[PDB]
Design a protein around this ligand. Structure first.
Ligand SMILES: O=C1Nc2ccc(Br)cc2/C1=C1/Nc2ccccc2C1=O
Length: 274
């Protein structure tokens, strides 16, 4: 574990801190994350979760009670890429490519019973070849948190990842966060103000959730054409199904891959300034 020379700190992960590093032994350049015991097992589980759109976990080093995770390294994250494309916007075909690749990754994970649980632009990594990859699966930003989590569901599903990805999809298109709440309640109310306060008609069981309160103000659902213009109907339709309140109504990654929005998907390459 002293076979790694640090080159720079590329992130302050929720869990710990992430470093760009190089293996003195195998010379490869990597991302090193400086982090109980079921941890060692579950994380270890993640090593065999290998897919082109999932950052590979290379090595797990437990030592000196200082768990080190060694990941494949990518030079840029989507957050920085969005900020750099803010003035011109990311071209739709690249938005579409990225969404499609991300859905492929999730459908893979989800098929193996792994959730990400904390998808955010910072956790999506891109390379020069037009690839995008899911990073840093969880075992401050609440902007991408699905409403069932905010309402106190402890046994949430793979649908929470579809929620987050839809929020990111929206942000790529409009160049502004869909629901930038700065508290849990603010986050929930921003969602309600836009998609309308949910009730038993559109979400059976919602008024029985642990943090649901009858006193929640009741907002009407906003015009969906108002939310992500000027995205086309293929796009809006896929996004609406990604943002269904009811987790069991929310589209699955696998079905999303079949939506007509991806009829003409291609794989462009971003112009990256590393
Ligand atoms: O390339 C990486 N692989 C990783 C694996 C796990 C975690 Br956590 C982060 C990263 C990576 C990161 N690469 C970056 C490039 C610019 C800014 C931030 C990051 C990362 O954060």
């Amino acid at each position: 574990m002293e076979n790694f020379q640090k080159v720079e700190k590329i992130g302050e992960g929720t869990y710990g801190v992430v470093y760009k590093a190089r293996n003195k032994l195998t010379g490869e350049v990597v991302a090193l994350k400086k982090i109980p015991s079921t941890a060692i097992r579950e994380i270890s589980l993640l090593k065999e979760l290998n897919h082109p759109n999932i950052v590979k976990l290379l090595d797990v080093i437990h030592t000196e009670n200082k768990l080190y995770l060694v990941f494949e390294f990518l030079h840029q994250d989507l957050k920085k890429f969005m900020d750099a494309s803010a003035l011109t916007g990311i071209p739709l075909p690249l938005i579409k490519s990225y969404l499609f690749q991300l859905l492929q990754g999730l459908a893979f994970c989800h098929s193996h019973r792994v959730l990400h649980r904390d998808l955010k632009p910072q956790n999506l990594l891109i390379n020069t070849e037009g690839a995008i990859k899911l990073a840093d699966f969880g075992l401050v930003t609440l902007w991408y948190r699905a409403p069932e989590i905010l309402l106190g569901c402890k046994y949430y599903s793979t649908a929470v990842d579809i929620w987050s990805l839809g929020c990111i999809f929206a942000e790529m298109v409009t160049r502004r966060a869909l629901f930038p709440g700065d508290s849990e309640i603010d986050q929930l109310f921003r969602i309600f103000r836009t998609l309308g306060t949910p009730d038993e008609v559109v979400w059976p069981g919602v008024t029985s959730m642990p943090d649901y309160k009858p006193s929640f103000p009741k907002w009407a659902r906003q015009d969906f054409s108002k939310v992500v213009p000027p995205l086309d109907e293929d796009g809006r339709s896929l996004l609406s199904q990604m943002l269904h309140y009811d987790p069991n109504k929310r589209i699955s990654a696998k079905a999303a891959l079949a939506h007509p929005f991806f009829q003409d998907v291609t794989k462009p390459v971003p112009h990256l300034r590393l």
